[PDB]
A and B are shown apart, each in its own frame.
With several copies, the nearest count.
Chain A
Amino acid sequence: AXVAX
């Protein structure tokens, strides 16, 4: 559900 920028 989390993803990084």
Chain B
Amino acid sequence: RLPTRSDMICGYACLKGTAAMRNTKRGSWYIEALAQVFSERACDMHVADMLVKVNALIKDREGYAPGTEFHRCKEMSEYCSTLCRHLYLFPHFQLAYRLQSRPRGLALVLSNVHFTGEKELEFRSGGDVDHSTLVTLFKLLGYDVHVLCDQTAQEMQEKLQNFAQLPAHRVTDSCIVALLSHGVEGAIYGVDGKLLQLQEVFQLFDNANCPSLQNKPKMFFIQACRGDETDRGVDQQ
């Protein structure tokens, strides 16, 4: 018998209280680093170690925008993990999760970029770059990629529950969900300005509501703010 929630790992563009940076040309700092790391290293490095390389890149980057409050600002990513084995994706077999099915799993990419103005939420310029980057990466890593753009909080909950219940999970070895939106600490915005709690999202995939993904790695990437301020950084002693 199993705990209610297990075998999950979650990557965050930023730390509690802080905000995530986005480049209006290139996309978010985090997706750009995440895609760069996974592309080059998925053949010989497990996911946890790989999010450590991503942490390394994010920690060295700084903002460039002379004039604005964003000049030289900083960012720190993080990951939180309940995995119980290595996650090698295999694009070592013995002490790592079974990851051998074709496709490797279903993957969902859920970008909110355009906002209907019910609250004061800005156009996520560069959001289209993030979205494309993740769909190609997940398709290259062997995943059946579902996508979903510009949803309300209600639509998001309902279709994320749909995605969790799909029969296809019975026959695959892993799962991936990537949420890119405006957010607050513990929740992200639908395009209608309404919030969705991340706990509820993770709940829809746990061992009690999503028994078809029991004991297989589930992988959440969350590109949203967790605060209202910017990080000016510290100098090095």
Contact = CB atoms under 8 A, between A and B. Distances in A.
B65 A5 contact: no
Range of interface residues on chain B? 20 to 34
Q: Is the interface of B mostly helix, strand, loop or mixed?
A: loop
Nearest to B223: A5
Contacts of A3: 21-24, 70, 122, 124-126
A4 B230 contact: yes
Contacts of B160: none
Nearest to B225: A5
Contacts, number: 46
B20 interface: yes
A3 B23 CA distance: 6
Interface string B216-230: 000000011100101
Q: Is the interface of A mostly helix, strand, loop or mixed?
A: strand
Interface string B112-134: 00000000001011100000000
B29 to A, nearest CB: 9
A2 B73 CA distance: 9
Nearest to A1: B65
Nearest to B63: A2
Nearest to A4: B19
B64 A4 contact: no
A4 B22 CA distance: 6
B64 A1 contact: yes
Interface of A: 1-5
Interface of B: 13-14, 19-25, 28, 63-65, 68, 70-71, 73, 122, 124-126, 182-183, 223-225, 228, 230
Given A2-B21, A2-B68, A4-B22, 11 more contacts: A1-B25, A2-B22, A2-B70, A3-B22, A3-B24, A3-B124, A3-B125, A4-B228, A5-B14, A5-B21, A5-B223
7 contacts: A2-B22, A3-B24, A3-B122, A3-B125, A4-B70, A4-B228, A5-B21
